Scaffold this active site. Structure first.
Site, PDB file in Angstrom:
ATOM      1  N   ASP A 189       0.656  -1.136  -0.077  1.00 35.86           N
ATOM      2  CA  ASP A 189       0.048   0.175   0.024  1.00 35.86           C
ATOM      3  C   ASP A 189       0.782   1.225  -0.085  1.00 35.86           C
ATOM      4  O   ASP A 189       1.445   1.581   0.807  1.00 35.86           O
ATOM      5  CB  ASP A 189      -0.854   0.131   1.105  1.00 35.86           C
ATOM      6  CG  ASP A 189      -1.830  -0.961   1.402  1.00 35.86           C
ATOM      7  OD1 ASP A 189      -1.622  -2.123   0.569  1.00 35.86           O
ATOM      8  OD2 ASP A 189      -2.883  -0.942   2.174  1.00 35.86           O
ATOM      9  N   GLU A 231     -12.580  -1.360   0.841  1.00 33.84           N
ATOM     10  CA  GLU A 231     -11.110  -0.729   1.429  1.00 33.84           C
ATOM     11  C   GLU A 231     -10.777   0.131   0.630  1.00 33.84           C
ATOM     12  O   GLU A 231     -11.207   0.666  -0.587  1.00 33.84           O
ATOM     13  CB  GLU A 231     -10.270  -1.784   1.284  1.00 33.84           C
ATOM     14  CG  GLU A 231     -10.552  -3.175   1.726  1.00 33.84           C
ATOM     15  CD  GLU A 231      -9.151  -4.001   1.695  1.00 33.84           C
ATOM     16  OE1 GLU A 231      -8.463  -3.958   2.490  1.00 33.84           O
ATOM     17  OE2 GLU A 231      -8.984  -4.813   0.645  1.00 33.84           O
TER      18      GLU A 231
END
Length: 538
Positions: A73, A335
């Protein structure tokens, strides 16, 4: 389209940010994913339409940190409109990193935030193959991030996904998910984990030799799940609550908002869905009953997207507002939400896994999207009501397998990308999880090639299409996270500037500008000369 139900009716009409209206990504909507799938697609080939499928990433890929760390990420340095900034000639990103010597699947409990940087203004094609980032190491001194927890007995303490907001003076407000775990040796909990939305403030110091970060020596606890709007650990041990993305809404200047992932606040074992969650048009022959869905297991999948409002300009205190999207009996995981504004519309992008879909539902890994006329609106899921914007190549006729165990009949790019993030101009960066077949696969832990998704094909606000003319048949630069704005600051005075402006600034000024940018004192005449000029491009 294969036969199946019609998608739900959504109006896109906007509500006040503070109202109690929550959009539903419905079962009728989600099942449009299966209708779009080609049932003839043979073994290992993609079954979803090419226009909503990410271009295929090669298995022979470079690594951005020269294997110094596992990277996943990642986020840029942004302002309140999500423009992406360099500071004094450096592009700067934040990434989740873990020790390379851990198994890739065990990175989650050892995640920390690190940063990379590279010089601004270099076209992707002229960088090193690997994107040419320099690893700057970890953001946080050891110990710092743990200090917000009352119970200091955690077995693991991690820093998870967020966003970073830059001020004109190189100050950074790093919003991130600060997590404590309290665990037994066999992957079982002593009590539920404790994920918090937090903030830490620091500052970029730059020069010819690179960037270093100062500050980030204190963390402020901003939000934790409440149990009326967002599910708590008492309601569900494996509750989701993470991924803050802050922005300003053009409709509401002077206020700052935040989206994040949560779950609908229901007790896990007594959770239920209703007719609206299902969302079928009256008399639709493919309609399900509420009874069948609530008996199916689907009620374990109740993800949502949360909204919060800032209570001061320092963004140090926040107030929850009602959820803007729920996916009850659709997915456990909406998400990494972001709001992206275009042509007066609010686009909600979000990512999800294939495995997290509820019973009876299926779809690819990747970016799911929604459009309405405000940040709280009766959102319309993109592309024929499906919500799919950018799926990994996926054969929906065969099981998905897992990134650590690919299915023999699945497309080798099924897990090629995750944690997608939509950048200005519809550029989408992501990290590589797994690429390859059952008997020949590799794990990534480095960024994929950046791709390009055009948003609003035709005049149709609700439609997206992948630009296959971009770069090489859809694939651009490895780890290309470009800045469209450029900061010039001595740490006190600063201006934001366009690509072109930046060019002629560096030219008109000479070597004293270097000292000024280094935070090194110049004469009062030289300082004024410099800042008057900067002001003219500002």
């Amino acid at each position: 389209l294969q036969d199946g139900p019609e998608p739900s009716i959504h109006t896109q009409q906007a509500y006040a940010p503070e109202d109690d209206f929550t959009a539903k990504w419905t079962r009728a909507d989600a099942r449009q994913l299966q209708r779009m799938s080609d049932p003839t697609a043979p073994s290992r080939e993609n079954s979803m339409p090419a226009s909503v499928t990410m271009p295929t990433v090669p298995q022979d890929f470079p690594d951005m940190s020269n294997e110094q760390v596992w990277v996943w990420d990642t986020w840029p340095l942004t302002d309140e409109d999500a423009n992406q900034y360099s500071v004094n000639g450096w592009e700067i990103i934040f990434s989740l990193v873990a020790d390379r010597n851990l198994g890739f699947d065990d990175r989650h409990v050892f995640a920390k935030i690190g940063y990379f940087y590279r010089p601004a203004g270099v076209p992707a094609a002229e960088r090193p193959e690997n994107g040419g980032w320099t690893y700057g190491g970890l953001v946080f001194k050891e110990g710092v991030t743990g200090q917000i927890f009352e119970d200091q007995s955690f077995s693991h303490q991690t820093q998870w996904t967020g966003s970073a907001r830059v001020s004109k003076n190189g100050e950074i407000k790093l919003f991130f998910t600060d997590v404590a775990f309290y665990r037994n040796s066999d992957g079982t909990n002593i009590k539920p984990y404790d994920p918090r939305i937090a903030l830490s403030v620091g500052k970029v110091k730059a020069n010819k030799k690179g960037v270093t970060l100062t500050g980030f020596n204190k963390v402020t606890d901003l939000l934790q799940a409440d149990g009326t709007y967002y599910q708590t650990g008492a309601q569900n041990e494996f509750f989701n609550f993470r991924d803050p993305f802050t922005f300003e809404d053009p409709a509401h200047p002077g206020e700052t908002f935040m989206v994040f992932e949560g779950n609908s606040a229901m007790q896990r074992e007594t959770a239920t869905c209703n007719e609206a969650d299902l969302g079928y048009r009256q008399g639709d022959p493919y309609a399900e009953t509420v009874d069948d869905v609530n008996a199916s297991g689907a009620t374990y999948q109740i993800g949502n997207v949360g909204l919060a409002k800032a209570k001061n300009k320092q963004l140090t205190e926040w107030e929850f507002l009602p959820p803007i999207l729920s996916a009850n009996c659709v997915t456990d995981q909406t998400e990494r939400p972001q709001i992206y504004f275009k042509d007066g519309k609010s686009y909600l992008f979000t990512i999800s896994h294939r495995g997290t879909f509820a019973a009876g539902l299926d779809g690819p890994e990747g970016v799911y999207g929604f459009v309405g006329d405000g940040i709280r609106s009766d959102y319309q899921p993109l592309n024929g009501g499906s919500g799919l914007a950018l799926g990994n190549p996926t054969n929906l006729n065969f099981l998905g397998g897992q990134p650590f165990a690919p299915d023999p009949n699945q497309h080798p790019g099924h897990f090629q990308a995750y944690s997608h993030y939509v950048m200005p101009g519809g550029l989408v960066q992501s990290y590589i999880d797994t690429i390859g077949t059952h008997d020949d696969f590799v794990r990534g832990g480095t960024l994929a090639p950046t791709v390009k998704m055009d948003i609003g094909v035709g005049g149709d606000s609700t439609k997206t299409a992948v630009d296959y003319s971009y770069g090489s048949e859809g694939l651009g630069g490895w780890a290309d996270i470009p800045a469209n704005k450029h900061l010039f600051t001595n740490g006190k005075f600063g201006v934001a500037v366009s690509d072109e402006a930046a060019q002629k600034i560096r030219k008109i000024l000479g070597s004293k500008f270097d000292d000024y940018l280094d935070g090194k004192p110049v004469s009062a005449t030289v300082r004024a000369l410099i800042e008057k000029l900067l002001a003219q491009y500002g």
